[PDB]
Design an enzyme around this catalytic site. Structure first.
Site, PDB file in Angstrom:
ATOM      1  N   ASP A  35      -0.218  -0.356 -16.730  1.00 30.13           N
ATOM      2  CA  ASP A  35      -1.233   0.441 -16.050  1.00 30.13           C
ATOM      3  C   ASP A  35      -2.111  -0.429 -15.163  1.00 30.13           C
ATOM      4  O   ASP A  35      -3.034  -1.075 -15.644  1.00 30.13           O
ATOM      5  CB  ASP A  35      -2.085   1.165 -17.092  1.00 30.13           C
ATOM      6  CG  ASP A  35      -3.172   2.020 -16.472  1.00 30.13           C
ATOM      7  OD1 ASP A  35      -3.098   2.286 -15.256  1.00 30.13           O
ATOM      8  OD2 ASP A  35      -4.076   2.450 -17.227  1.00 30.13           O
ATOM      9  N   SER A 199      -5.747   2.653   2.966  1.00 31.08           N
ATOM     10  CA  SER A 199      -4.639   3.112   3.777  1.00 31.08           C
ATOM     11  C   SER A 199      -5.120   3.469   5.175  1.00 31.08           C
ATOM     12  O   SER A 199      -6.247   3.919   5.364  1.00 31.08           O
ATOM     13  CB  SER A 199      -3.977   4.322   3.102  1.00 31.08           C
ATOM     14  OG  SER A 199      -3.010   4.940   3.933  1.00 31.08           O
TER      15      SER A 199
END
EC number: 3.4.23.22
Length: 330
Positions: A35, A199
């Protein structure tokens, strides 16, 4: 040193991925959920409340000659999906894919929430975010990666998750045969303890690319792709009959649909998520309403590039003095 381990979807939907991990001496192999959005290595154990164990493999520290109780240490974590676990702490030898750390904090669960009990395939979590998020008290502990880093050939790990197929986590090297083209690296902020990056935009299907900054985290421990409501609405508007269902808890779509791809930007580069990666199947057995793999982050408070996004890429988690993230197509 290096390590290399195969990671395997837990079910036919790729709801999560499990990776075998050797703990203790002799080795006890548990299948952990790696994770990159948390920083605790915790396991089902011989100390876990018996009624809360249902099929998981447990770590028994009393059977490990290298286990040592970390005196006074406790841990307690709550995850974004509302699940939680807590307990006490041992140090022990932990190996992943041939890479060994001695003195790793292994957090033994005394209690786990129902979601964990109900998932027989996940024996615990191995956190790979920054150690500043580790919950051990009163002395915070380091992640497996943080402990291994100085020994690694290069201070990196990579995630290469499969679509409906096994993939690989590598530690300490970049497998240049595992991706196509080049790896595009992008800046990381560690201010919130996550692999947080921005992004450069998105496209839906064959549509034009929208240049827009989307701050979010690269999170292997989250199934879906969570993005701003504007972006998610633009995606689902291209699927006839798709709608946001408050009763179901997100966007659903007719199972008869063909889903468009979704592209996200990494600098000037582009990662394309095929439409099929966005299908999470019937909302309940036999239903013709299917659950979407792109969902709104509104009210999560952060955008999350979970498995839906990451499995479309070869992803480098560069733990150099100034961390960065790399993405390549594959």
């Amino acid at each position: 040193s290096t390590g290399s381990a195969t990671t395997t979807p837990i079910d036919s939907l790729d709801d999560a991925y499990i990776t075998p991990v050797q703990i203790g001496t002799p080795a006890q192999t548990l299948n952990l959920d790696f994770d990159t959005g948390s920083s605790d290595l915790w396991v089902f154990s011989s100390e876990t409340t018996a009624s809360e164990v249902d099929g998981q493999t447990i770590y028994t520290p009393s059977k490990s000659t290298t286990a040592k109780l970390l005196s006074g240490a406790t841990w307690s974590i709550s995850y974004g999906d509302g699940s939680s676990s807590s307990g006490d702490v041992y140090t022990d030898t932990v190996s992943v894919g041939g890479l060994t750390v001695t003195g790793q904090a292994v957090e033994s669960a005394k209690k786990v929430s129902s979601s964990f009990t109900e998932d027989s395939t996940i024996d615990g979590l191995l956190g790979l975010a920054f150690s500043t998020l580790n919950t051990v008290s009163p002395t915070q502990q380091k992640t497996f990666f943080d402990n291994a880093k100085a020994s690694l050939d290069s201070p990196v790990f990579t995630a290469d998750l499969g679509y409906h197929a096994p993939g690989t986590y590598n530690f300490g090297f970049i497998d240049t045969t595992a991706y196509t083209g080049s790896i595009t690296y992008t800046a990381v902020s560690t201010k919130q303890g996550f692999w947080e990056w921005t992004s450069t935009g998105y496209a839906v299907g064959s549509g034009t690319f929208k240049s827009t900054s989307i701050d979010g985290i690269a999170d292997t421990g989250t199934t879906l792709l969570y993005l701003p409501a504007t972006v998610v609405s633009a995606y689902w508007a291209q699927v006839s009959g798709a709608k946001s269902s408050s009763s179901v808890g997100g966007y659903v779509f007719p199972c008869s649909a063909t889903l468009p791809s979704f592209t996200f930007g990494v600098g000037s580069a582009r990662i394309v998520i095929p439409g099929d990666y966005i299908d999470f199947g019937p909302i309940s057995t036999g239903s013709s309403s299917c659950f979407g793999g792109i969902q709104s982050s509104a009210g999560i408070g952060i955008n999350i590039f979970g498995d839906v996004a990451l499995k479309a890429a070869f992803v480098v988690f560069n733990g150099a003095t100034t961390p960065t993230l790399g993405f390549a197509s594959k």
